[PDB]
Amino acid sequence: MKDYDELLKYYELHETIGTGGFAKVKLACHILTGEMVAIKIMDKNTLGSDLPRIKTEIEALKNLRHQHICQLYHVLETANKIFMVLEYCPGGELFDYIISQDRLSEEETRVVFRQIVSAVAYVHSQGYAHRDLKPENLLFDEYHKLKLIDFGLCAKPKGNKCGALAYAAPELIQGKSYLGSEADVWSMGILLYVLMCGFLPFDDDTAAALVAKIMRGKYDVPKWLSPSSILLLQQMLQVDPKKRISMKNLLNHPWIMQDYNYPVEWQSKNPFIHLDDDCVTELSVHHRNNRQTMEDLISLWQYDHLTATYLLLLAKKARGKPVRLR
């Protein structure tokens, strides 16, 4: 099977999780390292209008590297297919966690929300806005840690020139000039509300009635919400993006800090410079090449088999497993 020749040199294929529209996900094992991955297989003759979104997502994931962002390891392409080798996320969607139970307690919400804030503060530090923050776009890994996905609508608000209406900021609906970041803080406000309430702050049977409600910015505060939760919600759900809470004040907000008593740690634990010597040395022995050639090659970050082997070795080291290539 043609479209699979190159992929099978590097990965041993396990079960198909399934197929939705143009995209199939298959579990696989990276041969050199033994690590489990998810492979997103996209058919080019089915993808159509979504091809530019696929390219936008790939460009963003090449440049973003964080403990709460689903990691891209490898991009492969044939006549008919684009393959994205991605971080293994068996825990399902935050959406599934919400619908499976009545509303989350303030405490359960904070555990999850502090991870969302970490990811988004990092995205913004890199000059990006995600623009499609919603619970279907947050996955749990096997350590029950959240991983942001679906960067197909993302942009660089200060660089070279969105999704579910219920999560969209007023200024984003009305198509305004902005610093862009502020719209993601509104979407995080919506997520905070839905997590603690089990329903949206703005919802309706028609798109025109929903738009009007978002523009109005009036929402109910249920009796089970604490005063602390109400105060944070008012600061995030400001219709005026200039009056809305900054990422800086969100990171050490009293609600965020409750029970933890330290601010959100958003800085990435996974660098682009600052290579891991153990991994570089082990790659050098496998490829029978000198360390410095190896460093120069890794630093190109081509998202080829080398990028994948380096990143999965680094993942294998973080587990506690030996830093060894088979």
Catalytic residue numbers, as ranges: 132
Alpha carbons within 13 angstroms on the beta-carbon side of residue 137 total: 23
How many CB atoms within 10 Å of residue 181? 22
Q: Decide which of a copy of itself, ligand NF5, none touches 273; Cβ closer than 5 to 8 Å per partner kind.
A: none
Question: Residue 273, interface with a copy of itself (CB under 8 A)?
Answer: no
Closest CA to 308 of 1, 3, 6: 6
Integer Rg of the chain from CA: 21
Quote the least distance from Cβ 156 to ligand NF5, whole Å: 22
Nearer to ligand NF5, 27 or 275 (CB): 27
Nearer to a copy of itself, 108 or 136 (CB): 136
- C-alpha span between 81 and 44 (Å, rounded): 6
Q: Please indicate if the annotation marks 19 as binding a ligand.
A: yes
Contacts of 194 (CB under 8 A, 6+ apart): 98, 135, 200, 201
Question: Residue 15, interface with ligand NF5 (CB under 6 A)?
Answer: yes
Q: Decide which of a copy of itself, ligand NF5, none touches 235; Cβ closer than 5 to 8 Å per partner kind.
A: none
Listing DSSP states for 291-323 in one string gives HHHHHHHHTT---SHHHHHHHHHHHHHHHT---
47-76 footprint of ligand NF5 as x/- string (CB under 6 A) = -----------------------x------
Nearer to a copy of itself, 160 or 206 (CB): 206
Q: Please indicate if the annotation marks 91 as binding a ligand.
A: no
How many CB atoms within 10 Å of residue 193? 24
Q: Please indicate if the annotation marks 189 as binding a ligand.
A: no
Question: Residue 46, interface with ligand NF5 (CB under 6 A)?
Answer: no
Binding residues for ligand NF5, per CB under 6 A?
A: 15-18, 25, 27, 38, 40, 70, 86, 88-90, 92, 139, 149
